Amino acid sequence: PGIWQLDCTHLEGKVILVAVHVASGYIEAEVIPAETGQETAYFLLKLAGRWPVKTIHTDNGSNFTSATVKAACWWAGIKQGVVESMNKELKKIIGQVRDQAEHLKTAVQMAVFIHNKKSAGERIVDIIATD
Amino acid sequence: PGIWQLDCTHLEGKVILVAVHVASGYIEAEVIPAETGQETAYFLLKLAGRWPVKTIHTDNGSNFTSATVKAACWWAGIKQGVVESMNKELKKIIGQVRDQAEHLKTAVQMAVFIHNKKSAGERIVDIIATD
Ligand SMILES: Cc1c(-c2c([C@H](OC(C)(C)C)C(=O)O)n(C)c(=O)c3ccccc23)cc(F)c2c1CCCO2
Ligand SMILES: Cc1c(-c2c([C@H](OC(C)(C)C)C(=O)O)n(C)c(=O)c3ccccc23)cc(F)c2c1CCCO2
Numbered sequence: 001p002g003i004w005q006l007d008c009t010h011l012e013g014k015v016i017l018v019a020v021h022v023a024s025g026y027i028e029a030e031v032i033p034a035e036t037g038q039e040t041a042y043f044l045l046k047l048a049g050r051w052p053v054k055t056i057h058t059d060n061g062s063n064f065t066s067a068t069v070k071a072a073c074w075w076a077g078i079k080q081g082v083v084e085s086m087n088k089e090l091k092k093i094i095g096q097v098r099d100q101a102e103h104l105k106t107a108v109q110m111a112v113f114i115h116n117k118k119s120a121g122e123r124i125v126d127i128i129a130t131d
Numbered sequence: 132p133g134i135w136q137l138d139c140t141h142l143e144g145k146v147i148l149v150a151v152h153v154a155s156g157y158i159e160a161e162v163i164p165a166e167t168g169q170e171t172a173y174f175l176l177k178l179a180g181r182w183p184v185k186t187i188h189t190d191n192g193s194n195f196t197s198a199t200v201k202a203a204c205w206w207a208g209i210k211q212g213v214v215e216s217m218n219k220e221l222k223k224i225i226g227q228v229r230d231q232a233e234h235l236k237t238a239v240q241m242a243v244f245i246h247n248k249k250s251a252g253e254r255i256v257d258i259i260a261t262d
Contacts, residue, residue: 028181045237049244050159050252076244106176113180113207121181122260129253129260 001131002054004047005083006063008035011094012104017043020086021051024123027090029112031105037066044069048076052128055079090115132262133185135178136214137194139166142225143235148174151217152182155254158221160243162236168197175200179207183259186210221246 003022008015015035019028028047032039040063047053056078058064064073064080073079093111094104101107134153139146146166150159159178163170171194178184187209189195195204195211204210224242225235232238 026181042237042240045240045244049240049247050157052252075241106173109173109176109180110206113176116180121183125256125260129256 001127002052003057004051004053004055005057005059006040006043007059007083007087008032008063009087009091011091014104016108018087018090019043019047020083021120021124022057022082023127024120025082025086026120026124027086027112027115029090029108031108037068040064041066041068041072044072044078045076048072048078051124053078057083086115086120132258133183134188135182135184135186136188136190137171137174138190138214138218139163139194140218140222142222145235147239149218149221150174150178151214152251152255153188153213154258155251156213156217157251157255158217158243158246160221160239162239168199171195172197172199172203175203175209176207179203179209182255184209188214217246217251 001023005020005022008017015032017030017032030043090111093114094107097110098107132154136151136153139148146163148161148163161174184207221242224245225238228241229238
């Protein structure tokens, strides 16, 4: 309901931060300059401002040890194979549309759109609203 | 239902792109480096990937003339005093929390969170889900 999994993946020497709403498979993603606490914190603030984020999961717990990330979670009131499949599907879609944009970040957002419409977007709206 | 108003506002020599979902008052915002078509286009791709965006309104139509923006609207299938009040409320909240962060962008996302929880976030979930 309020559980999100956040992980970073690397592509073309850039870092893609991927958040998956576990119950629906819905994704939000950003291309970030480096895999740093400051970027993770800022991403969390944005995420928490639009969805009711209760709990964050990750495949790399050390991701969430910086004072900056701890601050974001404190302020927003957050605590610590669906996700694997959603990440798999996203990487595949990026591959499929990559040639249609100059910038990786553009391909990433095209892939997020395709994924969420193919839905995960309808399902998250349903879960948060009925809950 | 699918109508969003996008406008830029300037604060501390930076540019804040503010999108308001007209029916609910819900806001998404980003601090962007410059008031350019490339930034607007990228913002639209992200917005359209998470919400069902049908129509975009603005107080400055010239904002949406670049080939980049036209491309975003084409690809995502988008066409061209609530908004004034929501923008007013956002600027006020940024003012109120500004001293709590180093970076303006951080204050902006704190203000978006406060605004959406004070709700606009619950109402958009309701409108998109029942529609
Ligand atoms: C100050 C701060 C920080 C914080 C920052 C802020 O910048 C980020 C880009 C990391 C979000 C800021 O603008 O102040 N910075 C820059 C820090 O250096 C920092 C150090 C320790 C603890 C928090 C922060 C991080 C947060 F997630 C946060 C807050 C305030 C409440 C909302 O959540
Ligand atoms: C190529 C492109 C462009 C586009 C780009 C892209 O970069 C942005 C940062 C502007 C999103 C890109 O990565 O290719 N660029 C860089 C252009 O120079 C451009 C020029 C004319 C028309 C579209 C674009 C803009 C779009 F909104 C877009 C697309 C493809 C379909 C999805 O929507």
